[PDB]
Design a protein around this ligand. Sequence first.
Ligand code: HEM
Ligand SMILES: N=NC(=O)c1ccncc1
Ligand SMILES: N=NC(=O)c1ccncc1
Ligand SMILES: N=NC(=O)c1ccncc1
Length: 249
Amino acid sequence: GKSYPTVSADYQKAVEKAKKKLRGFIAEKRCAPLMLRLAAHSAGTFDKGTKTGGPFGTIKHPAELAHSANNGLDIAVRLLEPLKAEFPILSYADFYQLAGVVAVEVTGGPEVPFHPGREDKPEPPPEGRLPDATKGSDHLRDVFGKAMGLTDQDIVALSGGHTIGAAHKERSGFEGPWTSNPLIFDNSYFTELLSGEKEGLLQLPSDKALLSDPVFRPLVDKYAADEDAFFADYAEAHQKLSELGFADA
Ligand code: HEM
Ligand SMILES: N=NC(=O)c1ccncc1
Ligand SMILES: N=NC(=O)c1ccncc1
Ligand SMILES: N=NC(=O)c1ccncc1
């Protein structure tokens, strides 16, 4: 359903150079999970009915950074600003989605296709559109489905983003990694989710909701058994997420 815009040769060269620089920077800083979260929080505010929100650069605005759901993302924005300044031709919107793509790649995840051309929009979306970690499957469908326009398969695959990183008691209040390898992108989120609560690892109520839903559970089982299947569905979902409202949504 996508029709991607034309960007200049100079834009495309910038991106390819920005992609490379982001790889080295994100690997060295150890900030891949935070960058993935930044990219996803940027995108996940899209509402399909009104065509508002989405991956359009607004997360850098103080008003959006102030959203409680975005606690700690100011760190991410600050970390990227020197690099972003090396690529003045790129939109923030593109730059942050590119950072998300690279975050997945440099932790060993799938190569998520990337298309340039998002424009930086002037107005952040209203607060409160991002998912609540204490809620369950109905809520996940409200947010990812009714608002964003993503599928049930997308919800499960994207929840697998928790295969990298950790919660922080000073940010959400939850604490610790979902996996034993929080800088490695693999199917371990699902493996852990299935085996039960292991000391030192985190499961949100929203993660656990996947285990009891009739549609979500078969997907968890598939991804735990088949990492290639996970990688394929993840790459599809991340691309869709990163393109919400862009080039047609
Ligand atoms: C399914 C609904 C989701 C809920 C309820 C949720 C909730 C959370 C919460 C509460 C945290 C901890 C923030 C903190 O205290 O630092 C977090 C972290 C994180 N989330 Fe999600 N999330 C969801 C989906 C996603 C998606 C779709 C992605 C990306 C594809 C994602 C990527 C991440 C990453 C990488 C972290 C780790 C951040 C870090 O290490 O600093 N999450 N998520
Ligand atoms: N959680 N913050 C980070 O990942 C980070 C912040 C500053 N420098 C390196 C990494
Ligand atoms: N950690 N949560 C996220 O990254 C996120 C999940 C859904 N929509 C936007 C952002
Ligand atoms: N679902 N809640 C969140 O994503 C969150 C809430 C507050 N601070 C960081 C993250």
